[PDB]
Swiss-Prot record:
Protein name (database record): Peptide chain release factor RF2
Subunit structure: Interacts with the ribosome. Recruited to stalled ribosomes by ArfA, in the presence of truncated mRNA, ArfA influences RF2 conformation so RF2 can hydrolyze the peptidyl-tRNA bond. Biotinylated tnaC mRNA can be detected in a stalled 70S ribosome-RF2-TnaC-tRNA(Pro) complex.
Subcellular localization, as worded in the UniProt entry: Cytoplasm
Function, as annotated: Peptide chain release factor 2 directs the termination of translation in response to the peptide chain termination codons UGA and UAA. Acts as a peptidyl-tRNA hydrolase. In the presence of truncated mRNA in the 70S ribosome, ArfA and RF2 interact such that the GGQ peptide hydrolysis motif of RF2 rises into the peptidyl-transferase center (PTC) and releases the ribosome. Recruited by ArfA to rescue stalled ribosomes in the absence of a normal stop codon. A TnaC-stalled ribosome binds RF2, but the active GGQ motif is prevented from engaging with the PTC by TnaC.
Lineage: superkingdom: Bacteria
Family that this chain belongs to: Belongs to the prokaryotic/mitochondrial release factor family.
Post-translational modification: Methylated by PrmC. Methylation increases the termination efficiency of RF2. Is absent when the factor is overproduced.
Additional note from the record: The gene for this protein contains a UGA in-frame termination codon after Leu-22; a naturally occurring frameshift enables complete translation of RF-2. This provides a mechanism for the protein to regulate its own production.
Amino acid sequence: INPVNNRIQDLTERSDVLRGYLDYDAKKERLEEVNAELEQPDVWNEPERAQALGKERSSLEAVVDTLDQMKQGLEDVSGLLELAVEADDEETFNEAVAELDALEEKLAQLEFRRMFSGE
RNA sequence: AGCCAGGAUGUUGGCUUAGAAGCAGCCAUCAUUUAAAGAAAGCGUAAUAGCUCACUGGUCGAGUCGGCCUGCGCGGAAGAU
Ligand SMILES: [Mg+2]
């Protein structure tokens, strides 16, 4: 269990680091304005511009959305772990141990993507 | 051959894409209500939407379709006293 324990916190830390690197607030802000623009119906009259806007939005959402998921997913995992601890059941514990890996992998992938920006 | 009607459902098939809803592609090209309805032949769009088409049901009420063999013609075919 000690390794599992180590993995929960470490993952969180790395997520935090990633977020910091991103400087996510700016991105969020951009998304917001972009979202607002999209909501306004006059943007779609000019097609190319609209398309561009759409392109801009999704990525912004997704990076930010990914981050959100990580934040939330991690929390969920923690909760699960807590539950397991409280109720001495093996299956739950096992689940707690396992589910975290996927999130970590996702995070890693995201980081990799961030790294290799050039075409 | 025209003419009148439908030209549905799962479904907007997923994806990758910025979006993809027959129609950017890439791929499967299946099944349903059955009279019949292509996971779609063309137009159309931001993409849907929208407008046709395929096949099929009515009207009508006799011939009709496009290959082959050969005859004769047509275009292709502009020049300097
Ligand atoms: Mg001749």
